Amino acid sequence: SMVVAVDGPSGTGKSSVAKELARQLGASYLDTGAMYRIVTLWVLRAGVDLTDPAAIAAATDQVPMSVSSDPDAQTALLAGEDVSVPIRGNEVTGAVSAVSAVPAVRERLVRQQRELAESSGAVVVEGRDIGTVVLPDADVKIYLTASAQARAQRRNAQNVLADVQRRDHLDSTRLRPAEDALEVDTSDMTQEQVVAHLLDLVRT
Amino acid sequence: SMVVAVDGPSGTGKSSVAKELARQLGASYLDTGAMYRIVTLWVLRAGVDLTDPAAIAAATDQVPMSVSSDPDAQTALLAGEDVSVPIRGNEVTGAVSAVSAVPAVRERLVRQQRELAESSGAVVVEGRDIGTVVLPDADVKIYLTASAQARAQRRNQRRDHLDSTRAVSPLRPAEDALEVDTSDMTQEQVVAHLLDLVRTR
Ligand SMILES: Nc1ccn([C@@H]2O[C@H](COP(=O)(O)O)[C@@H](O)[C@H]2O)c(=O)n1
Numbered sequence A: 001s002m003v004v005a006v007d008g009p010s011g012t013g014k015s016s017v018a019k020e021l022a023r024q025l026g027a028s029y030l031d032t033g034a035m036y037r038i039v040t041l042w043v044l045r046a047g048v049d050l051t052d053p054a055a056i057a058a059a060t061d062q063v064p065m066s067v068s069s070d071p072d073a074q075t076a077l078l079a080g081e082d083v084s085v086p087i088r089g090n091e092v093t094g095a096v097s098a099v100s101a102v103p104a105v106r107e108r109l110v111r112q113q114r115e116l117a118e119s120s121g122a123v124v125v126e127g128r129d130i131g132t133v134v135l136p137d138a139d140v141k142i143y144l145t146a147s148a149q150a151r152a153q154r155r156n157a158q159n160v161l162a163d164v165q166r167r168d169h170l171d172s173t174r175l176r177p178a179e180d181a182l183e184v185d186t187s188d189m190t191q192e193q194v195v196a197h198l199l200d201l202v203r204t
Numbered sequence B: 001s002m003v004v005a006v007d008g009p010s011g012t013g014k015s016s017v018a019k020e021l022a023r024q025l026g027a028s029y030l031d032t033g034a035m036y037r038i039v040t041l042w043v044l045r046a047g048v049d050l051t052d053p054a055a056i057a058a059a060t061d062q063v064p065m066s067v068s069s070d071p072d073a074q075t076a077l078l079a080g081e082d083v084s085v086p087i088r089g090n091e092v093t094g095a096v097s098a099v100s101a102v103p104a105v106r107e108r109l110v111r112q113q114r115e116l117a118e119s120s121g122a123v124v125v126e127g128r129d130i131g132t133v134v135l136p137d138a139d140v141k142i143y144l145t146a147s148a149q150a151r152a153q154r155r156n157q158r159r160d161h162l163d164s165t166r167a168v169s170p171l172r173p174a175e176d177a178l179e180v181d182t183s184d185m186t187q188e189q190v191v192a193h194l195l196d197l198v199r200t201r
C-alpha cells in the first residue's frame, strides 16, 4: 500500500501541500514536525534545562501525546489538552531544535512515526528525514525545495533573507535528500501548482 | 560605601534572604537572575533557535529592560510590559541556562550590573558570579550554600555536577567569600547571621 514521504526545509508551504496531496490521493496525513513540537511544549512546561540532554530524555519518557492522521481533522493533544495553538508559538519554535537533537527523543518519535505509518494504509508522511531515516522504503519520496529568496518572501509576508540564509549554512554544517528522492523546486510555483506537480509524479 | 555580593546555588532561599538583608542594611537590592530571565523571555518570544549562540547574541543587542534596585518595589519590565509573572514560569526556567551561557549576553548584563551597582550606593547584589566576576572587589562576599538533602526537601544532585563542570560560568565561590551553610537554618536565622557578618566587616 502507498507511502509518500515529503521532506524539505521550512518556508516552502510543505505542510499545506502535503495535506492537500493527501486529500487528493484519498490518503492519510502525518505531520511529524508537530510531534516534535508537542514534546517540546511538554519539556518547556516541566521547566527542564534545555542545555541538558539527559534531563530532556528523562523528562520525555512518557509524553501523553496524540495526533490525527486525517488531513481534515488535525489536532494536537497533550494530556487531553488541545495544544494546536501553543505548539505553533515562538516559545516552542525557539525550543524545538534543542529537544529534537536529543537522540532518546528521536528514537521514540521515529518509532511512533513508523507505527502510525504502517497502521494508516495509504499515507503521506511529512517532515525532514522521512525519506532518509524514518521511512526509507517509501514508495515515492519527494524533496520540496526553494531558493533562499523565495523562502524569505513567504516569511516576511507571513508577517529574514538574512535569517533564512543563515539557517541554511548552520543546517549544512550541523536537510539532505534521499538518493531516490524526487527534487522539486517550488520557487516559482503556487500551492495548487505544486500539488498538481506531485500528483503527476505520484501517478507515474 | 558598601557593596555586598551574595552568591550560591538555587533552592536555599537566597533571593528572599538577600532582599531582607537589603531592607535591614537600608541598602538597595539587585536581582541579577531576574535580568537573565528577562532576556530569556525576550529570546523565547522572538522564537530564536536556542541551539544557536550567534542567533541569541544577534537577537539580544537591544533588549528593552528595566529593573528596580528597591527591595520593596521589585518589578521586571520589558518593552514597558510588567513581566514579573512570566519571567518566573517554567518556560523561562528551562531556557534561561541556554541564554545565560552565551558570552555576548553575559558581557552586556555584567556591564549593566556593574553600572546599576555603582549608582545604587549601599547595595546587596545577588546572583552566582557576583563575588568572582561582576563585583570582585565587593566589601563583603557571601556564598550561601546547603546540602543536596536540604535543598531537595525545600523543593517539596544532578544539577550540582553540571553546574560544577559548566563552560561559561561554572559555580564556584570567591577565595575571600564567607561560606555559609544554611542547611540547619531558617530564613530569619540566615538573615541575622549575615547582618552579624556584615556588621563585623
Ligand atoms: N522530521 C522532523 C520534523 C521536524 N523536526 C524539528 O521540528 C522543527 C520544525 O518543525 P515543523 O516541520 O513543524 O516546522 C525543526 O526545527 C526541527 O528541529 C525534526 O527534527 N525532524
Ligand SMILES: Nc1ccn([C@@H]2O[C@H](COP(=O)(O)O)[C@@H](O)[C@H]2O)c(=O)n1
Pocket (backbone or CB within 6 Å): B010, B032, B033, B034, B036, B037, B096, B097, B100, B126, B127, B128, B129, B130, B169
Ligand atoms: N549572576 C547570575 C545569575 C543568574 N544566572 C543564570 O540565571 C539563571 C536564573 O537565576 P535565578 O534562578 O537565581 O533567577 C541561573 O540558572 C543561571 O543560568 C547567571 O548565569 N549568573
